[model samples]
Target: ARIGFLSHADMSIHFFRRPIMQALKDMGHEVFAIAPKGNFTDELAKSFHAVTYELDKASLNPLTVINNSKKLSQILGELNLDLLQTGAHKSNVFGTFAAKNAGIKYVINLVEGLGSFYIDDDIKTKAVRFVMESLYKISFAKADACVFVNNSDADYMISKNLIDKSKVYRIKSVGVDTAKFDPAITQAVDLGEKKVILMIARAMWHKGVREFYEAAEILNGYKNCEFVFVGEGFAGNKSTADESFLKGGKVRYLGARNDIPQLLKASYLLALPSYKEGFPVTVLEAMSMAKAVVASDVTGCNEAVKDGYNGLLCKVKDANDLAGKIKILLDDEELCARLGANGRSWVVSEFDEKQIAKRYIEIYRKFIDV
Candidate 1:
């Protein structure tokens, strides 16, 4: 099937969902991506042999939405897409409208995360959520299906009355590429004499940045333990929030990276202190690399980790609890090794990239005749 995937930003599509898109192409399907211009868009277009439709929503004026929706509809008519899949806030709405206008057979809405909508309490956030929910109910009323990263998000959407229960499916966070992020890779020689505690996520308030820093501060007092934060900053651009934690000798902030597999291989544990998530691919990537994890008991974290089994889960925003979990993993090598191994085994069995990609293809086929 010829599939057209639309996402909010280029980087979001590339880093988060590129594996499935590539899997589709490898299976001899035509895939196209529509997103805003960014560093990774051209590279993604080239890598997947997918056409790029650029729609930069610089302003959210109602007239701009009308114009962009019309242009998007025209573009869909030209592509004659068999199916349309979308993530990102703005692009989800646009793709829905465009698919409706072009009469596409299938439209799959992937709610990757609850972003500012569910997390923030501001007026604009509420207004945006209201409008978006209204549009989602109308535009996607006939959508073939909706995919969520975890069961919590699927339930949240249902509870909010955004989508019908029959159409929502819990597919997990796009699945992780286990082959590239394996445990048997060459380890970095410089990792000697240091127990690394690393986090791979953008520096955002809701990402549990403060709690992580506090946990790091407590962990740093121990011998040979080092903390690293690996990810590019988001709207705040690596501000003092992340920088303040690095001023000490124990913390290091490595800006945006392309070598996550290598980083995961070098690290001991992956920690994400986010207050919320749909499902984070970073946790899966870390687990696939055979590293133990310490994450908040949020939506995605709770799904990916089982306390005392694969990884430890701490209460969200609780620095003391997070510090204690990390301490347990750090103090006991045998326990850490066992947990990491279990995590690796779990990821292989349930969340392998190839298996999940086949599931998506099956979904696409399900709606092909509709």
Candidate 2:
């Protein structure tokens, strides 16, 4: 079998396409890496048959999108591929149409998360949501299957009639490495002696950045508490956090750091008051480390955290709820340890990367012999 994997950018595929692609290669199948040219494409060229096409992520012009689909189809046409897999919103929508046009036998689309369009109920957001659903309705018609990172997201699209229930599959975000995230493997990152309530996400409004800030203020009097925000940055969308907010002394903003396991090891707990997520792999890593989590009581979050079981679920967009939830974990060592233990056990059993890669194989095998 010859398989093609498509993503919007080179870095996206370079980061994720490895394990499953390796699994296929081990079975004597050929793997083709497809994306727009970027720094990582050269790296992919060394490992797999890398193909670059004319696609840019900078703008969302309708005319440009259509042209790129035509270009992608021509590129995919030359590949003589058996199956195509794509993730990310733009990649999934366009790749499905392109693969079908190229005469590919099977195409699979992954719903990473509903985009920022689902963040608010404003006019523009609703308009964007309508346009996306219309595109997905048809694109999914051509695609063989749609994989979701969480069951709640699967339930959402199936209920909306965008995709049929039979065509939908739930495979949580490319699983976490439990061995790498083990709490026993200690690291000496300077996270201070104060209890660290860490939130790692892009500095966006829907990630509950402002809610985290307010929660920090609410717990300012808790002498042993320290609120830390770790993220790279964000495009200057309306929801992007401003310099003032990022620099607001309430929370210590660390730009981006690759030492996630080290950070999770040092922190007291992980806090993600996000409005929504398809599935947060970061939460899984923290859970794997036996660190308690305080996440928003939304679809993706609630699915990972069993309220009082694995972690605490705070009310969405409510700073008081976030603060109170963090407070409970901070003051009670026994309860916090219990939650962390449950989280680690759950992740090892359900969200291990090796198991996740095997599940991908099972999904793909439905269409291909391998």
Considering every candidate listed, which one attains the maximal lDDT? 2
Error of 2 at 36 (Å): 3.2
lDDT of 1 by residue, 316-348 (tens): 879899889888888898998898899899899
Which residue pairs collide in model 2, if any? none
Model 2 residue 218 CA deviation in Å: 2.0
Report lDDT per candidate. Answer: 0.77, 0.85
TM per prediction: 0.90, 0.92
Count of backbone collisions in candidate 1: 0
Task: For each of the candidates, give the backbone clash count.
Answer: 0, 0
